[model samples]
Target: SLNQQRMNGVVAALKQSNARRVIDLGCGQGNLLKILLKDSFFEQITGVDVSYRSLEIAQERLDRLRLPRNQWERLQLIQGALTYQDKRFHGYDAATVIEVIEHLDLSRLGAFERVLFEFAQPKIVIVTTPNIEYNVKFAHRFEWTRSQFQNWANKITERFAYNVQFQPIGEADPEVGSPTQMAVFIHR
Candidate 1:
């Protein structure tokens, strides 16, 4: 249940930050969105994905739940790309990029930074990616070790004027750290 743990970690952070409105940048199938909708603490939840088909499935999955009117009203699923600057992405209290960035090519990361960290500029940004060192445990074409992830995260914070704190997302190996590495970027 690694994914369960990952989602739980994300929910815990969002709750601790008291973020009411949230956007899931690569919300494939809306697994996380489903959880958020269950809690009224999250006043608004939006799931954005590149595939319209995926959004359709997410819609169907949540539809099956027969959610309360208030919970149903709290959800939104939109088709969007992570690297594009869309005004719709702006002004959320927090943005979650769980298990999404590793799918992007290294060269395309700057565009993602501009779109999310620059334009969106949510007060809290939570990102989770596989720890490459844990490959002994997970093909992410570009899984990064803890230091590499932290280094990249640090650079982003420096340029964007945010502060980042790193956390282990799953059980740690002691030697390799954890199966997942998370960076919580707090806007300054």
Candidate 2:
């Protein structure tokens, strides 16, 4: 499934960065969170989302996993928006905003940027969004063409003092590029 590929891509990136404290912003239903729990390297894993019901479902899913108490204790599931300036968003070694930013209204991007790149201040940030140029093969509500994402992300690197690299997820097309594009930002 495309989802597994996306998750695998994200997990690989997280592994490469050697992040122990990781937060999954917009972690709906805990799909990615569930995967992180099985790995000891994550050490501390938190999932944040805007919807209470989604958080409830995420908690329910993790509860059913029946992980050991020690492992379970490492997880924190919280309800929050990516735009809010919450102290709880701070201090993560790495943060993932997978398949999430596109759902936000374009006007809210500045708030999201400040919240994640500035306030949250994770050492590394992994973000993935659909490539609008590949819409002929797939789709999304507010997808970005590769350069649009890169341009936006490049500005973050400039403003926030982080270096970023891009990667393609799934099959790549000759001109349109991949169905999904990812940006990995690491603080300098």
Candidate 3:
């Protein structure tokens, strides 16, 4: 599944960065954050989402993990919008935004970038969104071509003084094409 592959990629990236604290923006049910908490290297983990129901489900799932009280305390769930201004994210080592941007209104993406790449300025930012070329297979309100994705990424890198790299998700197949596009930005 794409989720499994994407999760693997996220974990690899986190380990590569040697990140101690991580945040997942638009974290839906907190599945990714849960997996990350299993790694001893990650001492602090946070999930943020605008949906209260999602946060509740994430909290319930974490509760079910039955971690010790202190371990559970290390996990945080914040109910907030990504586009909204936030001051709490200043020193996070890494942040993930998987399959999130597409769900947001296109007009709000600039605001989202400003908050993350400018205001918060985490050391590492990993983002994933559906490949617009593959939109014919799914029902989506919006998608971006590879060029569009690169354009936005380049703008962010230039504006925030970060180095950026792009990865194509899914096995390369000329017939089937790529399923998603992933990008990693490292703040200098």
Candidate 4:
């Protein structure tokens, strides 16, 4: 359950930094959104995913969380791809990509970056992935090293407002490194 732990850590950071409006990109089954809904600090939340089926499940799961009407009102779900621009994504204060971006090949990173960093820019953006040092040996998974992630994230600072931070999550091993890697981008 390292991924789950990683997400919880991400959410905690989101709360601490006062991110009110959040967009969950690639929000599969609304797992992370469910956690955010419990806290009123997130005034508005949107969950976006490519699969209509997944969006349906997310809606049901969130609805079944038995929240009040007003809370439900603050949430929105959209069926969309991160590679394309959509007006609905604009004006959010924060966005979370979770473990989503690694699924895209190198070619799609630009579209993904542009849609997020330029078109639908937010004040805070968080992205997490497995640490490459530990996950690279496995062919089934692909991860980026800390330096690789930092390089990619620093590119965002140039276009967006400012501030790029890298967070290493979980217990740090002396050699292998933390179980997960995270980048928090803040644009003021």
The reply for model 4, stretches above 4 Å from the true place, is 136-139
Worst 10 residues of 2 by lDDT: 135-144
Q: Which candidate would rank higher by lDDT, 1 or 4?
A: 1
Candidate 1 residue-wise lDDT, 7-101, digit = tens: 99999999999999999999999899999998889999999999999999999898878666667788888898888899899889999998888
TM-score of each: 0.95, 0.95, 0.91, 0.92
The backbone clash count of each candidate, in order, is 0, 0, 0, 0
**Candidate 2: where is the Cα deviation over 4 Å?**
137-141
Kindly state the number of residue pairs that clash in model 3: 0
Task: Give the per-residue lDDT of model 4 (tens digit) for 125-149.
Answer: 8999877786654333466777778
Q: What is the model-wide C-alpha lDDT for candidate 4?
A: 0.84
Model 2, 1-188: lDDT tens digits are: 77899999999998888888999999999999999998877899999998989999988888888665588889998898888988998889899999888888877888999999988999999999988889866544478888889998988988997999999898989999898899999998
What TM-score would you give candidate 1 relative to the actual structure?
0.95
Q: Candidate 2: lDDT over CA atoms?
A: 0.89
lDDT string, candidate 3, 63-178, tens digits: 77766546766788888989987887778999999988877777898899888998888999999987877766544648777777789899887889699998777764475357
- What are the lDDT scores of the predictions, listed in order? 0.89, 0.89, 0.84, 0.84
Span of 10 residues, lowest total lDDT, candidate 1: 136-145
TM-score of 2: 0.95
